[PDB]
Structures are given as C-alpha cells and as structure tokens.
From Swiss-Prot:
Disulfide bonds join C255-C290. The active site is at D35, S199. The keyword Disulfide bond applies. Keywords: Aspartyl protease, Disulfide bond, Hydrolase, Protease, Signal, Zymogen. The keyword Signal applies. Residues 17-328 form the Peptidase A1 domain. Its EC number is 3.4.23.22. One of its GO terms (biological process) is proteolysis. GO terms for molecular function: aspartic-type endopeptidase activity. It comes from Cryphonectria parasitica. It is an enzyme of class 3 (hydrolase). This is Endothiapepsin. Belongs to the peptidase A1 family.
Amino acid sequence: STGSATTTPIDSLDDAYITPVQIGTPAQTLNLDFDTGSSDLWVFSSETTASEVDGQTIYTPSKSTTAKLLSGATWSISYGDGSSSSGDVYTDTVSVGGLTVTGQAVESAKKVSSSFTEDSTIDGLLGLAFSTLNTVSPTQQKTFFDNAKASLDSPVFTADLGYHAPGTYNFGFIDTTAYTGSITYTAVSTKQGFWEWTSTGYAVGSGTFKSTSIDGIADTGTTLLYLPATVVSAYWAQVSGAKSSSSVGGYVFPCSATLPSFTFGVGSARIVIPGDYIDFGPISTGSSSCFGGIQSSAGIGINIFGDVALKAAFVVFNGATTPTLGFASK
Ligand SMILES: c1cc2c(cc1[C@H]1CCCN1)OCCO2
Ligand SMILES: c1cc2c(cc1[C@H]1CCCN1)OCCO2
C-alpha cells in the first residue's frame, strides 16, 4: 500500500504545516501537524477542556462506530518549546492520503497548553519519530508509520515541504519526479528516539565549505534551524546589523537586509537553503527588526534541522530494519 497527502503552511511565514487526516467512521477530518520529532498522535477532542478550545476542529469518539476506549491508558507530553498536552486514549481507524491503519492509538486531549489553544489552525499532532518516545502509559503505543510499515510497498515516508507553498508527505514510495539529481543517504541513530544524523558541515552564502560534524535531528515539527553557536554566529556575521537579542530571544536582523544562503552537508552532497527561507519577518507588527530562521541550539541540548532546513530538500525517512535518512535537492 501507499499514501500521499498534501501538507500546507498554516500562515504566511511557514510557521508550521498541516495535513488532513481522516479519523473514525464516518471519517472525521482533522488537520494535524506531522512531527518527525515526537511519537504521539493526539487530537483536540470532545473531551478537551472547553476554555482551551478556540477554533480547532475536534474529534468526537462517541460519533465514531470504530472508536474504542483504550481502558486505563493516559498520555502526557511536554515539548521543547514549552508547550504540552495530556489526556486519555482511543483506538480508531486513521487514514492519511489513502493509507489506512486500523486500531491506531488516537490520544484524546483533555488539557492543552496555551500555545495550542491560541493556534486555531492545528487540530493536533501526528508523531513520526520512533515509537520508543510514545508517552502512553501503562502500555506504550505505536506511531501511525510503525503500524503501517509492514503493509507499505517500501518501509519509508518522505517529506517534501514547500516554501510559501503546499508540499507533500508520501508513505510507502519515493516519487522520483519530486527531486533533482540523486538522493544521498546518511546514517541514523535511533538511540534517543529521533531521526538523528550527522551533517558533514556548512557554508554561508558563497563562502567556503567548512567540514565539521554536526549531530542533529530531522524534525518537521520544529520551524527553525537550530545549530551550534559557532555556526550561527558565522552566519549572522554576514548580515549587516544582525545581532542576538536576549529580550527577543534570538538573532534579529534589519528587515531591509538581503539574507545570504546557508548550505549544509549530507555526506559529500550539499543542500542549499536560500536566504529568503531564513526570514521570519518583523518581531512585532510594524517593526523593522526581523527574526532570523537560523538560531543557536545552545540551551536546547540538541541541534535541530527543522522546517527551514528540511523544506530546502526532498527528505526520505527510511524505516528499514536499519533506518537511514536521504536528502535530495529539488
Ligand atoms: C517546536 C519548536 C521547538 C521545539 C519543539 C517544538 C514542538 C512543539 C510541537 C511540535 N514540535 O523544541 C525546541 C526548538 O523549537
Ligand atoms: C517569528 C517572529 C518572531 C518570533 C518567532 C517567529 C516564528 C519562528 C517560528 C515560529 N514563529 O519570536 C521572536 C519574535 O519574532
């Protein structure tokens, strides 16, 4: 089997991407944030504290003939941006782009933190990291990908995120028309539950490539590119007037700037992030100070190849017995 679904930026800055997902019988379609940095499929629901719902579409298990309470199971998750959610669990039929899993754990939110409430466009998350990170207790549950894997034509999914445009998540096949050149594959460590790999280095604009190992994760659920302070300083030093602002919470730059590109290494291959991808716009409405899309990972404890990096590439998440990651230009 295979599946193919379009993923769409939630706003004009590509702050996140949402993908329609069918849950239950008859189908209830929710727009979920596909997140290769976590492993819980959770949704706003009829059980979510009413004051914490503001415009989201909710899953109502009582209206699904295939929903079953997973008795005794609870979940609770805290993310690296300080947000969180928790609740109980149902199993139900879940379909993405024509690919169906029966008996998928659908984690129903009873509580969500303020940033979830405040984002009306995201109805929940669909985790695509390794199932070892799943938070359901006392019986850990499998991700949608893990459940689908054996049925897929090939045990893979691909992320093809757009810049200011829709893109695609495919399950079970590699669309050879969706990228240029060849796909370069690189080793993955699953020891922390993430799609963790080692970049071979970087360049800033038209500068020389610096060969250096940068361990990090491929995370579709993080918006920005978080790298070591040395690398980030070298980037922003090429932008007149750029500086790190403790009050704003990262590097800012004059909105009048033209940003240089940023290249990262994948083995002997190179992925180029255009300068425009690194512009996240005014820090507040009407400000001439703009927020940067490359930020320091110092304090976070891990480097993160988030959407800013991934959207410059066609990315293969290879879930074979020994997982790997593939990157191609596009
Ligand atoms: C977003 C942004 C982050 C982050 C974690 C996240 C979570 C929120 C839900 C999906 N991803 O960790 C620190 C870097 O920024
Ligand atoms: C834009 C502008 C900002 C900002 C964050 C953003 C984007 C980056 C990813 C999600 N929101 O924080 C600091 C103020 O300006």
